[PDB]
Design a binder for these strands. Structure first.
Ligand SMILES: [Mg+2]
Ligand SMILES: [Mg+2]
Ligand SMILES: [Mg+2]
Ligand SMILES: [Mg+2]
Ligand SMILES: [Mg+2]
Lengths: 58, 51, 107, 156, 109, 336
RNA sequence: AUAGGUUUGGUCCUAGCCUUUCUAUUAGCUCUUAGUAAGAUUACACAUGCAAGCAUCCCCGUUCCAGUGAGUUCACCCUCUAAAUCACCAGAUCAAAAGGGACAAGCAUCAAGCACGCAGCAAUGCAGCUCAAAACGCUUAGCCUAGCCACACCCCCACGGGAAACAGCAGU
RNA sequence: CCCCACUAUGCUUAGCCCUAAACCUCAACAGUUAAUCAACAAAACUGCUCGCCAGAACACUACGAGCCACAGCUUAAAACUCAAA
RNA sequence: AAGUGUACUGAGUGCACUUGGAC
């Protein structure tokens, strides 16, 4: 996702999390505490990633 | 729908976090009781010797 | 170096290639000035014919005349290409046999 | 404002002693700061500032507590160099302490502003952001910058 | 919506407030080094319009592209102060936090 | 003469700062003007001089030293320095030298020509720690400031100067405000060069081609033509824009003096890198000429009747080297 | 690189240079035929011939094609929206100008640029803006090739001036 | 080179200059002893960061610049040469 | 003995430093 800006923040809050800002102004807060990296990847894929159908269409 | 599911999962993880914090707070209070006993013992000896 | 150091320093800056004796050109024209002989570095000793020639860029250089026999004389036009001689220190050019005043090798 | 503790002030270890005020005035004098060295004065100043500012003066490893202690040390070094103006070692220590206090102030500002403001007000420390560039101010640069400033003012 | 500016939404850090109602925000994008293939924080400077002058140096801000550039450089408006400097509220638990330690415990209410 | 009969009396009652325009190179008359006192030479407008070769500053200091020797004890001159009031180059070192030694005690009289930059140097020194803001006192009312008092004397006007003929705008254009960029041109015999409408050169009777490097204001057009067309172009384009100096068209040209001629013979050509002579058109600028080895050239410089044309030893003998390459058939070299 | 030779009395290591491979230009010597591809070194000057007509007059075209690489982050994406085609309109297509983003190399012995910003309807105020994460500046180069950018003798432009223009083909 | 006497200087104050085989010739921090390893030297390594080098000589040099306040230091090249060092 | 830095003198000496020397 070359155009999706990505920024990091070390030790800003007691708990870790992700937050995505969408073009529509919506903000999606994802809790990652206690989750493995694979689990986090799968969760973000489910909630915001294009499906294989869309990828094949492209 | 996906956003609603995300918020539901956030709520679930929040409940788990609250439970963890409750248990950790119980343990911390129990251990800090002994820590405070140690501190009181040290202080009492200090004040006694100084007096 | 570290990855950050490599990133900061970027790719290697290959130095520009120094211009050869012929200033990067495979050949040049020139006017002979003075012919003479030279002694090659030992163990090689056989006398070698050289000539001072003023290139098309004004620069004057000593150029080895290969082969046996010639007619090169003062103010005569020659063509000189690159190529240092094995045992003539300083001499870094060669008259191309078979061009202009350089009548073919006088065999 | 950095007035020193009154000499009569008893040491920290004895300010908590019961009946301390109900003993001989000579004993009080002996236990006072007057009959003690500068380390005791610095400790009393640290106690004063801690009680004044930090929410929990009982915590000594807090970032605020560290900043207070380091500020006390910096004051000590400043007073020391007011006399030993030629002490290069303590000059270095003062400069290092100032740098460390600036770093700790930055950390506190980034973490807990609500308390960073209280630290700054309590210790009279006007925090200043670091200069963007350290380029040496040599004669030519200074003169040309002054000339350019005057030129801009004239144009204005 | 149909904004003429390039980057619709960008999260950056306020690094200057010496301009009336305008905050100098620094935005950092991970950039792939074509050779090392490691990602580095390339950074660019943006100016965010702040009518309320609520920006403080060090704040983390979200900037929304203006419909049109309102000045030679002001191309975004401060949509929301994401992290007020040293006054961070954990978005997860909503309670104030100081670094990695809660001020008000989440069990408070 | 006015300076001799009004100001010299006061001066001959201490230190003198004699300012000399480096580009324009009153010196021999100093013994009567100031008298036998300590004098320091300040070569002004050095920044505008191109760096022809390394050590050109040292060469200029030397040249000033021989000029003073030609004219004076080394009146005694105790220091020769190069300064640029515009860029503040060397002003602080001059101040340090002034304050460092016993010999510099008393008042300071700043003597020089009109264009030397006395005003700029006085303002620079006033805006410095050297002064203890400025006052005006009759000597003629002149400026001064305490240091003992600094004295800024009236500038000595220069006779036979093209600036006198030129108007305010023309003088502003002619005077270089930025560092000068030499402009070289390879010329064959029987050709003509035009530095504005003020200066012209006709090169002829030359056994070989030569190079002419114009050192003048970057905004002064330089035009090359044949001898035949040189005149006709001159009348057609006098003033206007092709020759931007003077301005006003035929109206201004009617009052402008016609260009009188002056013949020149150049010495043996000292190679193709060392200038043989600088032909100076008063304060407008000069042209350094490099003939070929052993070559002797004939020249005719046309300069306004009132002003004068001066052939001098090259001020920047190695200025021909700084250049680029010939552009098209045009004689011009690409400027570096 | 599958490497090889070369420093020493000898060995090992480090390190450069050269050989081997494939291209292109030029040159020497040499050479039979056929098809195809490609073709000034020169942004130096040009003799000569030609390269823009069509058409019931008005119009339209000669702004294209063709050429060169001097200069050079004017090329790509997004926004908006001119001109043009769709016998008219349509929105469609094409793509200018303008705004945002992106975008070569070396030099730091080019370290500061010197107004390079902002608010305000305006007065006017604020005093800022870029830069060691390379600003500013000097030097070199056409590029990211179905093609693209730029130039059209020069004065960046071209009213005007310089002067009489092949970087259109053939040719000198 | 040896003997004699003596001066800068070694010393105090107040300012400057900023270079040493300024060397443990072994950068900071964390970690390990698992399988040793050009040679010698202070056993061998891992992670992490900053600085530095890209053959020799030209060259602790020239030019420019900074510090100077003019006889010096820092920064630091190029050309030419060689197949070595 | 060798060398680094520094200064005088015309290769040595003076001061400090290192062993990249011996006991
Ligand atoms: Mg052939
Ligand atoms: Mg044009
Ligand atoms: Mg042409
Ligand atoms: Mg042709
Ligand atoms: Mg003595």
């Amino acid at each position: 996702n070359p155009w999706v800006q990505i920024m990091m923040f070390k030790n800003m809050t007691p708990s870790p999390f992700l937050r995505f800002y969408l073009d529509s102004g919506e903000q999606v807060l994802v809790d990652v505490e206690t989750k493995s990296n694979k689990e986090i990847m799968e969760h973000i894929r489910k909630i915001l990633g294009k499906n294989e159908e869309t990828l094949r269409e492209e | 729908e996906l956003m609603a599911w995300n918020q539901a999962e956030n709520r679930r993880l929040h409940e788990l976090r609250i439970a963890r914090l409750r248990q950790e707070e119980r343990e911390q209070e129990q251990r800090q009781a002994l820590e405070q006993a140690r501190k009181a013992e040290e202080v009492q000896a200090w004040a006694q010797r100084k007096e | 170096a570290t990855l950050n150091q490599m990133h900061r320093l970027g790719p290697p800056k290959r130095p520009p290639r120094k211009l050869g004796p012929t200033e990067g050109r495979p050949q040049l024209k020139g006017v002979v000035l003075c012919t003479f002989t030279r002694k090659p570095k030992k163990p090689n000793s056989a006398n070698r014919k050289c000539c001072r020639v003023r290139l098309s860029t004004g620069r004057e250089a000593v150029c080895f005349i290969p082969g046996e026999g010639h007619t090169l004389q003062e103010h005569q036009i020659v063509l000189v290409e690159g190529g240092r001689t094995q045992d003539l220190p300083g001499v870094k050019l060669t008259v191309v046999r078979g061009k202009y005043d350089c009548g073919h090798v006088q065999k | 404002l950095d007035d020193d503790p009154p000499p009569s002030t008893l040491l920290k270890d004895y300010q908590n002693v019961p009946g301390i005020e109900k003993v001989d005035d000579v004993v009080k004098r002996l236990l006072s700061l007057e009959m003690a060295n500068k380390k005791e004065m610095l400790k009393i100043k640290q106690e004063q500032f801690m009680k004044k500012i930090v929410a929990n003066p009982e915590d000594t490893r807090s970032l605020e507590a560290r900043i207070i202690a380091l500020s006390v040390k910096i004051r000590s070094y400043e007073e020391h160099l007011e006399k030993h103006r030629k002490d290069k070692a303590h000059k270095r220590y003062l400069l290092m302490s100032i740098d460390q206090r600036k770093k700790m102030l930055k950390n506190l500002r980034n973490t807990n502003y609500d308390v960073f403001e209280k630290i700054c007000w309590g210790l009279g420390i006007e925090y200043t952001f670091p200069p963007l560039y350290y380029r040496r101010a040599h004669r030519r640069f200074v003169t040309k910058k002054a000339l350019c400033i005057r030129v801009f003012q004239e144009t204005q | 919506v149909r904004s003429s500016v390039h980057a619709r939404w960008i999260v950056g850090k306020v690094i200057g407030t010496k301009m009336q109602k305008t905050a100098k925000v620094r935005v950092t994008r991970l950039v792939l080094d074509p050779y090392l293939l490691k990602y580095f924080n390339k950074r660019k400077t943006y100016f965010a319009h702040d009518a309320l002058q609520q920006c403080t140096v060090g704040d983390i801000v979200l900037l929304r592209a203006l419909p049109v550039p309102r000045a030679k450089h002001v191309k975004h408006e401060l949509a929301e102060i994401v992290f007020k400097v040293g006054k961070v509220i954990d978005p997860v638990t909503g309670k104030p936090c100081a670094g990695t330690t809660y001020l008000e415990s989440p069990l408070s209410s | 003469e006015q300076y001799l009969e009004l100001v010299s009396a006061a001066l001959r009652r201490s230190l003198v700062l004699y300012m000399v325009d480096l580009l324009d190179l009153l010196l021999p008359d100093l013994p009567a003007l100031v008298g036998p006192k300590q004098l320091i030479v300040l070569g002004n407008k050095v920044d505008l001089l191109p760096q022809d070769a390394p050590g050109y500053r040292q060469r200029l200091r030397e040249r000033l030293w021989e000029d003073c020797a030609r004219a004076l004890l080394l009146t005694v001159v105790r220091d020769v320095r190069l300064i640029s009031a515009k860029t503040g180059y060397g002003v602080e070192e001059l101040i340090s030298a002034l304050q460092r030694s016993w010999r510099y005690r008393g008042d300071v009289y700043l003597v020089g020509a009109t264009n030397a930059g006395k005003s700029t140097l006085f303002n620079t020194l006033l805006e410095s720690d050297y002064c203890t803001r400025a006052t005006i006192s009759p000597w003629l009312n002149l400026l001064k400031f305490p240091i003992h008092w600094f004295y800024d004397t009236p500038g000595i006007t220069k006779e036979n100067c093209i600036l006198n003929l030129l108007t305010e705008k023309e003088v502003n254009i002619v005077l270089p405000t930025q560092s000068i960029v030499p402009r070289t041109f390879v010329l064959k015999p029987g050709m003509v060069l035009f530095l504005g409408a003020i200066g012209r050169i006709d090169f002829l009777q030359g056994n070989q081609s030569a190079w002419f490097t114009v050192v003048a204001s970057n905004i002064l057009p330089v035009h090359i033509t044949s001898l035949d067309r040189a005149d006709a172009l001159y009348q057609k384009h006098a003033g206007h824009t092709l020759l931007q100096i003077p301005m006003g068209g035929k109206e201004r040209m009617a009052g402008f003096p016609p260009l009188v001629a002056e013949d020149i013979m150049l010495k043996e050509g000292l190679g193709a890198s060392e200038a043989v002579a600088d032909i100076k058109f008063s304060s407008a600028g000069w042209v350094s000429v490099t003939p070929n080895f052993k070559d002797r050239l004939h020249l005719r410089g046309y300069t306004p009747e009132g002003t004068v044309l001066t052939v001098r030893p090259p001020l920047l003998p190695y200025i021909v080297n700084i250049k680029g390459q010939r552009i098209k058939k045009s004689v011009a070299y690409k400027t570096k």
